[PDB]
């Protein structure tokens, strides 16, 4: 029963490459997705406008010449005063989006970054979960959103991917329609 | 900053229930994936998900409770999608068998995603026990000027930062 290894994992091989964790990880978090970003006034226009993201803290470094935007969908009447405190609230949030801006990368026509789909390979994507493909897509139309794919293209319909202004894709699903699709 | 007009305060309320779902990586090889994340890192093995048709699957991982997924195909699809930051490990078939084959992880020529990110308890104890396990580090804990964070790599060599966030703080 192990398969051709031309046709992917049984699920016996796979779960059985799976162990309980380990109770010293309990209390971990999955906390941030860096990406590298040319534009932060694009880019923090599209999370925050666009896509609905608060804007959790800005970092800056001056000697290295490069700041950090942390992005999530959080409740702005959260989010701490106090430096110290925002901190450690900001960075201890599930789900958020860092975006990395190198200095100088806006004015540079000759500089672009590589969103992972096209060789080399490797990151895909990220992906919000909506409550209705087909009108949040209708708004992102609206805004001027481009589009990877569109919710009624392709076979698999209903759900869909826009690119951020560093052509990052953003795949956009409904959760109780997934299982419709696949 | 300049940047002072491009945080939109106050979202636009059809954006109310959005929720930040996902992260997908590509894997050369989900058995050595697999074994990484769920215990070295200790994640859950949500879902795992075939498309012959296409040959791929996607495996799903989150920091989840195994008794809280639903055992029912359609009811566990629906719970895996509305899970809060899930990795989506995508496994094109065969590429575990091509020695001439490997993913990019974003930090060389050309550059683009940069890491995915867990926040720990105690940053020193969560590094000991990877050293322990032979996980591979780009950066201990004690080197340069940050110290106190770690970022380590994972079996394609995606870069995973390990952080407190109180010690950011700081
Ligand atoms: C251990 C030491 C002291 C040293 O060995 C040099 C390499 C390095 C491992 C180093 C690295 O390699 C890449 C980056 C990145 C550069 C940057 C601006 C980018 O490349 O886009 C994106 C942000 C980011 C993570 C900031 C932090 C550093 C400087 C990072 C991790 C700090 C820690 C550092
Ligand atoms: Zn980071
Ligand atoms: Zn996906």
Request: charged content about 30%; proline content about 7%.
């Amino acid at each position: 029963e192990p398969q051709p290894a031309s046709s992917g994992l049984t699920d016996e091989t796979a779960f059985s490459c799976c162990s309980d964790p380990d109770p010293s990880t309990k209390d971990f978090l999955l906390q941030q997705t860096m990406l590298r970003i040319k534009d932060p006034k694009k880019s923090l226009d599209f999370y925050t406008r666009v896509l609905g993201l608060t804007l959790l803290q800005k970092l800056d470094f001056p000697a290295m010449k490069f700041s950090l935007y942390f992005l999530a969908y959080e409740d702005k009447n959260d989010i701490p005063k106090d430096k110290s405190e925002k901190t450690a609230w900001t960075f201890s949030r599930k789900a958020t989006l860092e975006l990395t801006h190198n200095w100088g990368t806006e004015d540079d026509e000759t500089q672009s970054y590589h969103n992972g789909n096209s060789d080399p390979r490797g990151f895909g994507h990220i992906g919000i979960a909506v409550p209705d493909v087909y009108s949040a897509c209708k708004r992102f139309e609206e805004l001027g959103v481009k589009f990877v794919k569109k919710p009624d293209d392709g076979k698999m319909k209903g759900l869909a991917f826009i690119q951020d202004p560093d052509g990052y894709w953003i795949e956009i699903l409904n959760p109780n329609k997934i299982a419709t699709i696949i």
